[PDB]
């Protein structure tokens, strides 16, 4: 087998009141994301013959 | 892991597979080998 | 956190930090599209509309 990693989706940021500027809500919302796999196989083939 | 905002697949890219191979103990040999051998060329 | 760098073959960060450029260029770009108007900017289809 072989595997490979795939990279995930995006995300996107948020938009703060400028009324909150001075809470801790000015940094915003937060991103996340984790990876995924893929595999790979074969499979065999044969032939045979008499002389 | 699991905890931080970014992850991985799976524990297999969390893991190291060492190809080193080991073994328990093992029962001495004694008696195979301590009798004389006679040869012989016929039945 | 600290200990996910260390628990993990690969390094993490530069996942990171391109994941957080391009959610701020994709919220970007979809609020200037759509974007409402209350504390976002107004998008061409709202101003569009509301005109």
């Known amino acids: 087998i ?12 948020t938009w703060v009141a400028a009324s909150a500027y001075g809470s801790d809500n000015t940094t915003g919302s937060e991103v996340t994301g984790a990876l995924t ?3 790979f196989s074969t499979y065999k083939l044969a032939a045979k013959s008499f002389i | 892991n699991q ?3 970014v992850e991985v697949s799976s524990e297999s890219y969390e893991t190291i ?6 073994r328990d103990l093992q029962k001495e040999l004694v008696v195979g080998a301590l009798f004389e051998e006679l040869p012989m060329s016929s039945k | 956190t600290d200990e996910t760098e260390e628990d993990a073959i690969f390094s993490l960060l530069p996942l990171l930090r391109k994941r957080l450029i391009e959610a701020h260029a994709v919220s970007i770009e979809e609020a200037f599209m759509t974007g409402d108007g209350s504390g976002k900017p107004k998008g061409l289809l709202t101003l569009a509309s509301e005109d």
């Open chain 1, 2 to 13: 072989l595997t490979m990693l795939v990279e995930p989706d995006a995300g996107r940021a």
């Open chain 1, 37 to 39: 796999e893929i595999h």
């Open chain 2, 3 to 5: 905890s931080s905002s």
């Open chain 2, 17 to 22: 597979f060492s190809q080193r191979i080991i």
